[PDB]
Protein backbone atom coordinates (compact mmCIF):
# COMPACT_ATOMS: atom_id res chain seq x y z
CA UNK A 1 0.00 0.00 0.00
CA UNK A 2 1.44 3.33 -1.14
CA UNK A 3 0.43 6.86 -0.06
CA UNK A 4 -2.94 6.78 -1.83
CA UNK A 5 -3.61 3.28 -0.47
CA UNK A 6 -2.80 3.92 3.21
CA UNK A 7 -5.11 6.92 3.60
CA UNK A 8 -7.78 4.76 1.94
CA UNK A 9 -7.14 1.92 4.40
CA UNK A 10 -6.82 4.30 7.35
CA UNK A 11 -10.05 5.98 6.21
CA UNK A 12 -12.27 2.89 6.18
CA UNK A 13 -9.98 1.25 8.77
CA UNK A 14 -8.76 -1.94 7.10
Amino acid sequence: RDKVQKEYALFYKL
Epitope: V4, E7, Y8, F11, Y12, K13, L14
Partner: antibody, heavy 122, light 109 residues
Protein backbone atom coordinates in the same frame (compact mmCIF):
# COMPACT_ATOMS: atom_id res chain seq x y z
CA UNK B 1 -18.10 -1.62 -16.68
CA UNK B 2 -21.72 -2.16 -15.64
CA UNK B 3 -23.66 -2.80 -12.44
CA UNK B 4 -27.18 -4.05 -11.74
CA UNK B 5 -29.03 -4.35 -8.44
CA UNK B 6 -31.96 -6.73 -8.01
CA UNK B 7 -34.33 -7.81 -5.25
CA UNK B 8 -36.49 -4.70 -4.87
CA UNK B 9 -40.24 -4.97 -4.50
CA UNK B 10 -43.20 -4.61 -2.20
CA UNK B 11 -42.60 -5.82 1.36
CA UNK B 12 -44.63 -5.61 4.56
CA UNK B 13 -43.54 -3.50 7.56
CA UNK B 14 -41.19 -5.65 9.62
CA UNK B 15 -40.38 -8.14 6.87
CA UNK B 16 -36.93 -8.76 5.42
CA UNK B 17 -35.50 -8.51 1.91
CA UNK B 18 -32.08 -9.30 0.40
CA UNK B 19 -30.78 -7.02 -2.35
CA UNK B 20 -27.96 -7.98 -4.72
CA UNK B 21 -25.46 -5.97 -6.77
CA UNK B 22 -23.90 -7.93 -9.64
CA UNK B 23 -21.12 -6.73 -11.94
CA UNK B 24 -20.97 -7.24 -15.72
CA UNK B 25 -17.64 -6.03 -17.08
CA UNK B 26 -15.46 -5.76 -13.98
CA UNK B 27 -14.83 -7.57 -10.69
CA UNK B 28 -15.26 -6.86 -6.98
CA UNK B 29 -11.68 -7.84 -6.07
CA UNK B 30 -9.97 -5.47 -3.61
CA UNK B 31 -12.38 -2.55 -3.91
CA UNK B 32 -15.11 -0.83 -1.93
CA UNK B 33 -18.80 -1.42 -2.63
CA UNK B 34 -21.16 1.21 -1.23
CA UNK B 35 -24.95 1.26 -0.96
CA UNK B 36 -26.89 4.53 -1.28
CA UNK B 37 -30.68 4.75 -1.02
CA UNK B 38 -32.91 7.64 -2.04
CA UNK B 39 -36.51 7.96 -0.90
CA UNK B 40 -39.00 9.13 -3.55
CA UNK B 41 -38.40 12.81 -4.21
CA UNK B 42 -35.82 12.99 -1.42
CA UNK B 43 -32.03 13.23 -1.23
CA UNK B 44 -29.23 10.69 -1.23
CA UNK B 45 -28.48 8.76 1.97
CA UNK B 46 -25.28 6.84 2.63
CA UNK B 47 -26.24 3.62 4.40
CA UNK B 48 -23.64 0.85 4.22
CA UNK B 49 -20.16 0.07 2.92
CA UNK B 50 -18.16 -3.13 2.45
CA UNK B 51 -14.60 -3.73 1.23
CA UNK B 52 -14.36 -6.95 -0.79
CA UNK B 53 -10.65 -7.20 0.05
CA UNK B 54 -11.02 -8.60 3.57
CA UNK B 55 -14.77 -8.23 4.12
CA UNK B 56 -14.83 -4.99 6.13
CA UNK B 57 -18.36 -3.61 6.42
CA UNK B 58 -19.63 -0.27 7.73
CA UNK B 59 -23.23 0.75 8.34
CA UNK B 60 -24.97 4.06 8.93
CA UNK B 61 -26.85 4.78 12.15
CA UNK B 62 -30.20 4.62 10.34
CA UNK B 63 -29.61 0.95 9.47
CA UNK B 64 -27.57 0.08 12.58
CA UNK B 65 -28.00 -3.61 13.37
CA UNK B 66 -30.99 -4.08 11.04
CA UNK B 67 -29.09 -4.50 7.75
CA UNK B 68 -26.08 -6.55 6.68
CA UNK B 69 -23.74 -6.15 3.70
CA UNK B 70 -22.47 -9.38 2.13
CA UNK B 71 -19.78 -9.96 -0.49
CA UNK B 72 -20.16 -13.53 -1.74
CA UNK B 73 -17.59 -13.33 -4.54
CA UNK B 74 -19.16 -16.34 -6.28
CA UNK B 75 -20.42 -14.74 -9.50
CA UNK B 76 -18.88 -11.41 -8.41
CA UNK B 77 -21.70 -9.63 -6.60
CA UNK B 78 -22.41 -7.81 -3.34
CA UNK B 79 -25.56 -8.27 -1.27
CA UNK B 80 -27.54 -6.20 1.24
CA UNK B 81 -29.68 -8.11 3.75
CA UNK B 82 -32.42 -5.99 5.35
CA UNK B 83 -34.03 -7.36 8.51
CA UNK B 84 -36.75 -5.41 10.34
CA UNK B 85 -37.97 -2.98 7.68
CA UNK B 86 -40.11 0.13 8.07
CA UNK B 87 -41.89 2.66 5.87
CA UNK B 88 -38.89 5.00 6.11
CA UNK B 89 -36.79 2.35 4.33
CA UNK B 90 -38.85 2.85 1.16
CA UNK B 91 -36.46 4.24 -1.44
CA UNK B 92 -34.37 3.45 -4.51
CA UNK B 93 -31.23 1.56 -3.47
CA UNK B 94 -28.05 2.07 -5.51
CA UNK B 95 -24.69 0.34 -5.33
CA UNK B 96 -21.44 2.06 -6.28
CA UNK B 97 -17.90 0.78 -6.80
CA UNK B 98 -14.69 2.64 -5.94
CA UNK B 99 -11.13 2.21 -7.15
CA UNK B 100 -12.30 2.22 -10.78
CA UNK B 101 -10.32 5.41 -11.42
CA UNK B 102 -6.63 6.11 -10.76
CA UNK B 103 -5.35 8.17 -7.85
CA UNK B 104 -7.43 10.00 -5.26
CA UNK B 105 -10.46 9.94 -7.58
CA UNK B 106 -10.69 6.21 -6.84
CA UNK B 107 -11.82 7.03 -3.30
CA UNK B 108 -15.20 8.17 -4.65
CA UNK B 109 -18.15 6.27 -6.11
CA UNK B 110 -17.00 5.86 -9.72
CA UNK B 111 -19.41 3.23 -11.07
CA UNK B 112 -23.11 3.23 -10.16
CA UNK B 113 -26.00 0.91 -10.90
CA UNK B 114 -29.45 1.88 -12.18
CA UNK B 115 -30.95 1.31 -8.72
CA UNK B 116 -33.65 -1.03 -7.41
CA UNK B 117 -36.83 0.33 -5.83
CA UNK B 118 -38.04 -1.08 -2.50
CA UNK B 119 -41.57 -0.31 -1.30
CA UNK B 120 -42.46 -0.97 2.35
CA UNK B 121 -46.18 -0.86 3.17
CA UNK B 122 -49.23 -3.05 3.74
CA UNK C 1 -22.08 14.27 10.56
CA UNK C 2 -24.26 16.79 8.74
CA UNK C 3 -23.49 18.71 5.53
CA UNK C 4 -25.99 21.56 5.42
CA UNK C 5 -26.35 22.70 1.81
CA UNK C 6 -27.39 26.16 0.63
CA UNK C 7 -29.35 27.00 -1.30
CA UNK C 8 -31.89 24.19 -1.65
CA UNK C 9 -32.89 25.44 -5.12
CA UNK C 10 -31.51 28.04 -7.52
CA UNK C 11 -32.80 29.48 -10.80
CA UNK C 12 -30.17 30.77 -13.22
CA UNK C 13 -30.10 31.67 -16.91
CA UNK C 14 -28.06 30.06 -19.66
CA UNK C 15 -24.48 31.30 -19.43
CA UNK C 16 -24.98 32.59 -15.89
CA UNK C 17 -23.24 31.45 -12.72
CA UNK C 18 -24.61 29.50 -9.76
CA UNK C 19 -23.05 29.03 -6.32
CA UNK C 20 -23.82 26.19 -3.90
CA UNK C 21 -22.50 26.28 -0.33
CA UNK C 22 -21.87 23.08 1.63
CA UNK C 23 -21.37 23.49 5.39
CA UNK C 24 -20.30 20.39 7.32
CA UNK C 25 -21.17 19.83 10.98
CA UNK C 26 -17.55 18.77 11.59
CA UNK C 27 -14.20 18.70 9.84
CA UNK C 28 -13.88 16.01 7.18
CA UNK C 29 -11.15 13.39 7.47
CA UNK C 30 -9.22 15.51 4.94
CA UNK C 31 -9.78 17.60 1.82
CA UNK C 32 -9.26 14.40 -0.21
CA UNK C 33 -12.67 13.18 1.04
CA UNK C 34 -15.09 15.83 -0.23
CA UNK C 35 -16.79 15.58 -3.62
CA UNK C 36 -19.75 16.87 -5.61
CA UNK C 37 -22.23 14.61 -7.39
CA UNK C 38 -24.62 15.56 -10.19
CA UNK C 39 -27.89 13.63 -10.37
CA UNK C 40 -30.67 13.97 -12.94
CA UNK C 41 -34.16 12.47 -12.58
CA UNK C 42 -34.32 8.73 -13.12
CA UNK C 43 -30.52 8.38 -13.25
CA UNK C 44 -27.86 7.47 -10.68
CA UNK C 45 -25.59 10.21 -9.31
CA UNK C 46 -22.43 11.14 -11.19
CA UNK C 47 -19.13 12.27 -9.71
CA UNK C 48 -18.32 15.86 -10.69
CA UNK C 49 -15.59 17.16 -8.35
CA UNK C 50 -13.25 15.07 -6.19
CA UNK C 51 -10.72 16.02 -3.51
CA UNK C 52 -12.77 19.17 -2.82
CA UNK C 53 -11.22 20.97 -5.80
CA UNK C 54 -10.16 18.44 -8.48
CA UNK C 55 -12.14 18.17 -11.71
CA UNK C 56 -13.27 14.58 -12.18
CA UNK C 57 -12.27 12.86 -15.40
CA UNK C 58 -14.60 13.91 -18.20
CA UNK C 59 -16.22 16.86 -16.40
CA UNK C 60 -16.23 20.22 -18.22
CA UNK C 61 -14.26 23.19 -16.94
CA UNK C 62 -17.47 25.05 -16.07
CA UNK C 63 -17.48 23.29 -12.68
CA UNK C 64 -15.11 24.46 -9.95
CA UNK C 65 -14.66 23.14 -6.42
CA UNK C 66 -13.26 25.06 -3.47
CA UNK C 67 -13.13 24.88 0.32
CA UNK C 68 -11.51 22.85 3.07
CA UNK C 69 -12.13 21.60 6.59
CA UNK C 70 -15.86 22.21 6.94
CA UNK C 71 -16.83 24.96 4.44
CA UNK C 72 -17.02 24.01 0.76
CA UNK C 73 -18.40 25.72 -2.33
CA UNK C 74 -19.46 24.54 -5.79
CA UNK C 75 -19.39 27.02 -8.68
CA UNK C 76 -21.00 26.38 -12.07
CA UNK C 77 -19.94 28.81 -14.79
CA UNK C 78 -21.40 29.27 -18.28
CA UNK C 79 -24.55 27.52 -17.12
CA UNK C 80 -25.98 25.27 -19.83
CA UNK C 81 -29.24 23.35 -20.12
CA UNK C 82 -27.33 20.09 -19.68
CA UNK C 83 -26.44 21.28 -16.16
CA UNK C 84 -30.12 21.10 -15.13
CA UNK C 85 -30.10 18.65 -12.22
CA UNK C 86 -29.63 18.20 -8.46
CA UNK C 87 -26.17 18.54 -6.91
CA UNK C 88 -24.99 16.90 -3.68
CA UNK C 89 -21.85 17.34 -1.60
CA UNK C 90 -20.51 14.14 -0.03
CA UNK C 91 -17.84 14.31 2.66
CA UNK C 92 -15.89 11.43 4.14
CA UNK C 93 -15.34 11.30 7.90
CA UNK C 94 -13.28 8.08 8.26
CA UNK C 95 -15.78 5.18 8.48
CA UNK C 96 -18.88 6.73 6.90
CA UNK C 97 -19.86 9.28 4.27
CA UNK C 98 -22.44 12.06 4.49
CA UNK C 99 -24.51 13.58 1.69
CA UNK C 100 -25.86 17.11 1.70
CA UNK C 101 -29.55 17.83 1.40
CA UNK C 102 -29.19 18.55 -2.31
CA UNK C 103 -29.63 21.68 -4.41
CA UNK C 104 -31.91 21.67 -7.45
CA UNK C 105 -30.54 23.79 -10.31
CA UNK C 106 -33.08 25.08 -12.85
CA UNK C 107 -31.65 26.62 -16.03
CA UNK C 108 -33.51 29.44 -17.77
CA UNK C 109 -33.15 29.05 -21.53
Amino acid sequence: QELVESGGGLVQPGGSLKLSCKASGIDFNNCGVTWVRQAPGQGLEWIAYIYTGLGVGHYASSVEGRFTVSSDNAQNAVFLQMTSLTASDTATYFCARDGVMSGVEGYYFNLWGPGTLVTVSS
Amino acid sequence: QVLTQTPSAVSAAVGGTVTINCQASQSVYSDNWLGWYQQKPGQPPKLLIYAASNLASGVPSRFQGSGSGTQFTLTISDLQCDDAATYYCAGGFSPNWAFGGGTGVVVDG
